[PDB]
Amino acid sequence: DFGLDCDEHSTESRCCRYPLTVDFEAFGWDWIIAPKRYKANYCSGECEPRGSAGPCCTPTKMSPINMLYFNGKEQIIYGKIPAMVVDRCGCS
Amino acid sequence: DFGLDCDEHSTESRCCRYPLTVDFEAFGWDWIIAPKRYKANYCSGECEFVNPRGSAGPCCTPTKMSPINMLYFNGKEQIIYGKIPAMVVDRCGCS
């Protein structure tokens, strides 16, 4: 099947996926040209190398984003950065 | 911190650190010279509260991990000696 999606107003106790904007500009990371901002989302809820065996509401599928940024050497980098967007949440 | 250690068959519900041996020789990775076997451990237990991780809910996860040095083949009479990061769980906690 699929993962569950929730808003800030859900009274959902199970492993669910919530919206979240990651703001690089707000972090102050100005070496990042684009994007200044993107939708990352996150996982939260209960479940009835990485060293965790216990079930946990974790991203079960993530997708990359393309970024444009400085290394400060008059060197601008355009790259595909993996695992930046939580597309789906589930337990282990 | 929240560093509890448990052995197997422990009666424990809280976030604890359990033993686990990773055994390259028994697994058959004969290209791995050393270590043949090492203590990796893992985290397990419940966590109460009243970017490429993207998890907010509390979870029993390693709060500290350490590397191991490995000696292995690429099969070209090429033996590689390197520091391999995050291979040993040293401590477990909720965050």
Residue numbers in the entry:
A (entry chain B): 1 to 48, 66 to 109
B (entry chain A): 1 to 50, 65 to 109
Article sentences:
Growth/differentiation factors 8 and 11 (GDF8/myostatin and GDF11/BMP11, respectively) are two closely related members of the activin/inhibin subclass that share ~90% sequence identity in their mature, C-terminal signaling domains and ~52% identity in their N-terminal prodomains. Similar to other TGFβ ligands, GDF8 and GDF11 are disulfide-linked dimers that are initially synthesized as precursors, which are cleaved by furin-like proteases to separate the N-terminal prodomain from the C-terminal mature domain. The ligand dimer elicits signal transduction by symmetrically binding two type II and two type I transmembrane serine/threonine kinase receptors. Similar to other ligands in the activin/inhibin subclass, GDF8 and GDF11 predominantly signal through the type II receptors, activin receptor kinase IIA (ActRIIA; ACVR2A) and ActRIIB (ACVR2B) and the type I receptors, activin-like receptor kinase 4 (ALK4; ACVR1B) and ALK5 (TβRI).
We resolved the structure of apo-GDF8 to 2.25 Å and the apo-GDF11 structure to 1.90 Å using X-ray crystallography, thus allowing a direct comparison to the recently published apo-GDF11 structure (middle). Unexpectedly, resolution of the apo-GDF8 structure revealed a unique conformation such that the fingertips of each monomer are positioned proximally in a “closed” conformation compared to the classical distal positioning or “open” conformation observed for many ligands, including structures of FS-bound GDF8 (top). While the structure of apo-GDF8 adopted an unexpected “closed” conformation, a similar conformation has been observed for activin A when in complex with ActRIIB. In both cases, the wrist region is disordered and not resolved in the crystal structure. The extreme “closed” conformation of GDF8 is not entirely unprecedented, as one structure of activin A in complex with ActRIIB showed a similar “closed” configuration. Interestingly and despite the high sequence identity, nearly identical crystallization conditions resulted in two distinct conformations. Although these conformations may be a result of the crystallization process, it supports the idea that GDF8 and GDF11 are flexible enough to be trapped in alternate states. Taken together, crystallization of both GDF8 and GDF11 in their apo states reveals intrinsic structural flexibility in these ligands.
